Design an enzyme around this catalytic site. Sequence first.
Site, mmCIF file in Angstrom:
data_model
loop_
_atom_site.group_PDB
_atom_site.id
_atom_site.type_symbol
_atom_site.label_atom_id
_atom_site.label_comp_id
_atom_site.label_asym_id
_atom_site.label_seq_id
_atom_site.Cartn_x
_atom_site.Cartn_y
_atom_site.Cartn_z
ATOM 1 C CG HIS A 314 -0.541 -8.269 -26.199
ATOM 2 N ND1 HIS A 314 -1.525 -8.418 -25.253
ATOM 3 C CD2 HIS A 314 0.156 -9.388 -26.194
ATOM 4 C CE1 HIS A 314 -1.424 -9.593 -24.688
ATOM 5 N NE2 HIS A 314 -0.415 -10.217 -25.262
ATOM 6 C CB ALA A 315 5.056 -8.154 -25.725
ATOM 7 C CG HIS A 344 8.138 -15.006 -25.009
ATOM 8 N ND1 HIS A 344 7.879 -16.332 -24.760
ATOM 9 C CD2 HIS A 344 7.266 -14.611 -25.949
ATOM 10 C CE1 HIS A 344 6.835 -16.694 -25.511
ATOM 11 N NE2 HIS A 344 6.434 -15.653 -26.233
ATOM 12 C CD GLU A 345 6.994 -11.071 -27.622
ATOM 13 O OE1 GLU A 345 6.970 -11.367 -28.855
ATOM 14 O OE2 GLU A 345 6.079 -11.306 -26.769
ATOM 15 C CG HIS A 348 8.104 -15.136 -30.751
ATOM 16 N ND1 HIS A 348 7.710 -16.440 -30.919
ATOM 17 C CD2 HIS A 348 7.233 -14.606 -29.829
ATOM 18 C CE1 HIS A 348 6.651 -16.682 -30.140
ATOM 19 N NE2 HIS A 348 6.346 -15.592 -29.447
ATOM 20 C CD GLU A 372 4.461 -18.426 -28.398
ATOM 21 O OE1 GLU A 372 4.942 -17.520 -27.631
ATOM 22 O OE2 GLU A 372 3.855 -18.214 -29.496
ATOM 23 C CG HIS A 471 -4.020 -14.680 -25.509
ATOM 24 N ND1 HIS A 471 -3.756 -13.744 -24.525
ATOM 25 C CD2 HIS A 471 -2.834 -14.986 -26.058
ATOM 26 C CE1 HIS A 471 -2.453 -13.484 -24.500
ATOM 27 N NE2 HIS A 471 -1.870 -14.214 -25.425
ATOM 28 C CE1 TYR A 481 2.261 -17.669 -25.815
ATOM 29 C CE2 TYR A 481 -0.140 -17.751 -25.765
ATOM 30 C CZ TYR A 481 1.040 -17.209 -26.260
ATOM 31 O OH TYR A 481 1.026 -16.176 -27.147
#
Length: 575
Positions: A314-315, A344-345, A348, A372, A471, A481
């Site tokens: 999972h990323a 997206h990552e 972060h 996010e 999740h 999200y």
Amino acid sequence: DEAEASKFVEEYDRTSQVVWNEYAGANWNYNTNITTETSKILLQKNMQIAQHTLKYGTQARKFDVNQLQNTTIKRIIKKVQDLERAALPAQELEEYNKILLDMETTYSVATVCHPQGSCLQLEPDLTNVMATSRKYEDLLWAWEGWRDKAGRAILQFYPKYVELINQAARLNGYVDAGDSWRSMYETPSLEQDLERLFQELQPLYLNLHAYVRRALHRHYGAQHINLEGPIPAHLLGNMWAQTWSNIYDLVVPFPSAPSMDTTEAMLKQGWTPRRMFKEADDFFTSLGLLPVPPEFWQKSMLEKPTDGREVVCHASAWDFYNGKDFRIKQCTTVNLEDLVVAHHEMGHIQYFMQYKDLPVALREGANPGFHEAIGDVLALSVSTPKHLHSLNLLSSSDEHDINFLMKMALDKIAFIPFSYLVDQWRWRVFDGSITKENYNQEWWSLRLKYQGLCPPVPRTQGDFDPGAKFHIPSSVPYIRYFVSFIIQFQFHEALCQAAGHTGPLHKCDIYQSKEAGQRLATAMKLGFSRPWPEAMQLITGQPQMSASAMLSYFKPLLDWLRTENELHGEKLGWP
Ligand SMILES: *[C@@H]1O[C@H](CO[C@@H]2O[C@@H](C)[C@@H](O)[C@@H](O)[C@@H]2O)[C@@H](O[C@@H]2O[C@H](CO)[C@@H](O[C@@H]3O[C@H](CO[C@H]4O[C@H](CO)[C@@H](O)[C@H](O[C@H]5O[C@H](CO)[C@@H](O)[C@H](O)[C@@H]5O)[C@@H]4O)[C@@H](O)[C@H](O[C@H]4O[C@H](CO)[C@@H](O)[C@H](O)[C@@H]4O)[C@@H]3O)[C@H](O)[C@H]2NC(C)=O)[C@H](O)[C@H]1NC(C)=O
Ligand SMILES: C[C@H](N[C@@H](CCc1ccccc1)C(=O)O)C(=O)N1[C@H](C(=O)O)C[C@H]2CCCC[C@@H]21
Ligand SMILES: *[C@@H]1O[C@H](CO)[C@@H](O)[C@H](O)[C@H]1NC(C)=O
Ligand SMILES: [Cl-]
Ligand SMILES: [Cl-]
Ligand SMILES: [Zn+2]
């Protein structure tokens, strides 16, 4: 005394760096080398951080925050009095930890098998089935079988998890764990604000839903699609029907206008995961934002390893709480979805770097949604035709334009009601409205109400479909999200305007805009130091969340959908 509060937050900060670093170190060593040996070290570091939380949290609770002048020391100490699960007595915390481990491991080793042949995992095997099969029954086998093996096996754990997680929340002064979670926004009007926002997206979602519904009726036949009813939950290209871009080929507004194989072009051109992350790094540095440090390139896990080592795929993005060492862990596939997830990552990561000088208790996003949204903002620009052309994954008209907006709608609009409903559901579980007698029924009631989906197979006792989304067994809040999907468009609109872009918002590409970089940096530097409407004002010049920017981005698409649905006599929604 003001000085005794300064001293304590000083000590808390020094000792949290050490102890939080040790634990992230060990949770990484586990997460990229699942052994029993890395499980022993992980379990020992758990205790150590619980024992630190308890010590510092008990001291923080002896302060009267009412009597404290300095607003920074006041905010730090109020957060430290929240021990989270470390509030639990010894036995119960042992059991809380083991249930979360059990939940996540059950989700991760679950397979679905054919009698006499092969067993498919979720990643990539079943995900590919849901993405490329166009046969009702093969989609069904994967959709139902994933629920059967993952969902049902989680159910045995879920009542005791709710009970322990609500027990921790109450011992930190909340009513239940959903209260606790919502408190991260510091926004008493949160549930109303959220609902208003979801209501403004209804014309777009209902129109998209009707149009896609008509297209599934063409492909899968009149006997399987009610033109006035919900869509079956297995025909949208995705295990959870949370994004719909894999059925782009059934729903093309203008098939006449041909669009390229982004995925075939990426392979064709020898794109690797590393090149994918280097493109993200470059976009951030075009903005004048920060580069990932060399260490990140050496220590990250940017692709599934092949050395035997087993890993959690999972990323996720990793702060090591020393201002130097940040990592992404992702089993990256070479394609478009994953390029956007890499962004997206990387957002972060950018946030971690921007706020590394704050004290650790403030080392977080201004709210979880902010955390996010950052990467998604950059990715809206990446995904433009103009930008994809310049990576040479596209060629290049109104037809092309409506086609692009449709592709975007299927990833962005579609996800709106799904992202809303996850925690709608959990909030009612935590507050005791929903019992284990009706976990599943209430899930499907919301799937219907917000998404307009139905289950292709009538659900039965023992089903626990929420356990089939990561999740839920992993206890990661989801409302963030929904917030992200709203505020990311607000952020794009502002940076676009900072960057001098004129004409329709969706043609905007902010590559190389130092002005756009600036707007974001000064907000991200704030961390969690100030209430979030301040960061919003910094970025957008006003302090509300607002669906205006999103509706405006898709306005050409709304016009088209409405003329199209009207032309066929579509009846929007579902009695
Ligand atoms: C309420 O107290 C607030 C907090 O005070 C701080 O916390 C308490 C616990 C005690 O430790 C205090 O003694 C301490 O001051 C207070 O807010 C602070 O106000 C000052 C200004 O008075 C702000 O200072 C700026 O910090 C910038 C960067 O910060 C970090 O990076 C430094 C880089 O060298 C480093 O020295 C230091 O490092 C570590 O500290 C944190 C701990 O907080 C740690 O977690 C982390 O690992 C760090 O590495 C530092 O924290 C500076 O670069 C900045 O300099 C600017 O000014 C220069 C001189 O004019 C210019 O040349 C330059 O261009 C810069 O623009 C400046 O020193 C501080 O950031 C701020 N604290 C926070 C977190 O908000 C507040 O004033 C109090 N309220 C009232 C009304 O009194
Ligand atoms: C991949 C992404 N992973 C999550 C991290 C999840 C996680 C949290 C804490 C411990 C371990 C894992 C994140 O980076 O926010 C994710 O799950 N999703 C969510 C999902 O895929 O359901 C919703 C997505 C919106 C668009 C970007 C990706 C978001
Ligand atoms: C993985 O397994 C054990 C656990 O620490 C260790 O002996 C080995 O070196 C680890 N290998 C890595 C991190 O590649
Ligand atoms: Cl489901
Ligand atoms: Cl959240
Ligand atoms: Zn994220």
